[PDB]
Design a protein around this ligand. Structure first.
Ligand SMILES: Nc1ncnc2c1ncn2[C@@H]1O[C@H](COP(=O)(O)O)[C@@H](OP(=O)(O)O)[C@H]1O
Ligand SMILES: Nc1cccc2ccccc12
Length: 288
């Protein structure tokens, strides 16, 4: 029942229907250009939000609305090329999106010239967002309850494997990469400062009004209304939805998990989280 959803490779779970083992086996020797940009996330942590943000920053047609092209074609998923784009002929600087773990990266990323932006989010909101997204999307197995999906999640039996392993392998191996770390919650709290830090790390210059436009079009409620970024057509017509009521930009709030997890589930999660993360000095926000 569960083999047809996950493709395991070196202890990591790819989405089986979207990638083939040929491309996975080819990832190690993939040509990396010295100005490539990689958005690396664990699923449901702000991937397409960051796609939108980087598209607004790097493609002035998208920012000025002279071009009307979906953000997935600006920063396509490195391992999920659902639009069948020839990544080799895409113009530099290429932007890619990916959920792969540190040890599955193309060795060209270890030359530390291509840049990596790692976006993370508190794992309880990640859990609940993944729960709803799996209920909605056909490419994922349909979970029954919150308790059962939490078990499935802490077991790593989802696309992206175990959240703790993902974030740990990326952080505990910072120095193999030219990489920055930023949190969904920080982007939620100060969008403008986060955009500025992204531009600094990517050493991309922007005028002040351009940054105003980036913040304006990357805000949740405005981006949900932007069909170039809200992924509505992609999930309805290409990837397929079980119902037709849910959306990729569901709520986008921090702290919503408190309405789904009982105190017992939360405390068990906290024990696992402390065991896995007590040494990692990343700031974590859990509410508002
Ligand atoms: N501009 C934006 N601003 C704030 N939150 C956003 C956002 N775009 C997406 N989000 C939220 O990012 C989550 C999906 O992230 P990803 O792209 O990694 O799959 C969703 O969380 P929620 O399910 O809590 O709403 C989505 O609502
Ligand atoms: N975040 C994601 C993980 C795996 C597959 C996806 C497909 C489409 C959009 C987003 C995806």
């Amino acid at each position: 029942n569960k083999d047809e959803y996950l493709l395991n490779f070196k202890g990591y779970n790819f989405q089986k229907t979207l990638v083939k083992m040929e491309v996975v086996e080819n990832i190690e020797n993939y040509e990396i250009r010295d100005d490539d940009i990689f958005i690396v996330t664990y699923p449901k942590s702000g991937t397409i939000w960051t796609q939108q943000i980087l598209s607004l920053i790097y493609f002035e047609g998208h920012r000025n609305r002279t071009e009307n092209i979906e953000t997935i074609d600006r920063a396509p998923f490195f391992e999920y090329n659902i639009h069948k784009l020839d990544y080799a002929k895409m113009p530099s600087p290429r932007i890619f999106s990916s959920h792969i773990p540190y040890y599955l990266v193309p060795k060209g990323l270890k030359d530390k010239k291509a840049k990596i932006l790692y976006i993370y989010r508190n794992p309880k909101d990640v859990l609940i967002s993944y729960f709803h997204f799996s209920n909605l999307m056909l490419i994922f197995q349909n979970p029954d309850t919150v308790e059962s999906f939490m078990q499935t999640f802490l077991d790593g039996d989802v696309v992206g494997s175990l959240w703790f392993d993902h974030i740990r392998g990326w952080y505990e191996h910072r120095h193999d990469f030219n990489i920055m770390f930023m949190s969904f919650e920080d982007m939620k709290k100060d969008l403008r400062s986060s955009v500025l830090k992204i531009c600094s790390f990517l050493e991309k210059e922007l005028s002040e009004e351009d940054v105003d436009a980036v913040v304006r079009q990357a805000t949740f409620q405005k981006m949900k209304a932007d069909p170039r970024a809200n992924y509505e057509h992609i999930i309805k017509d290409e990837l397929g939805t079980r119902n037709e009521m849910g959306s990729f930009l569901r709520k986008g709030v921090v702290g919503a998990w408190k309405h789904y997890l009982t105190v017992d589930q939360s405390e068990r999660f906290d024990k696992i989280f402390h065991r896995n993360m007590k040494n990692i000095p990343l700031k974590f926000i859990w509410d508002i």
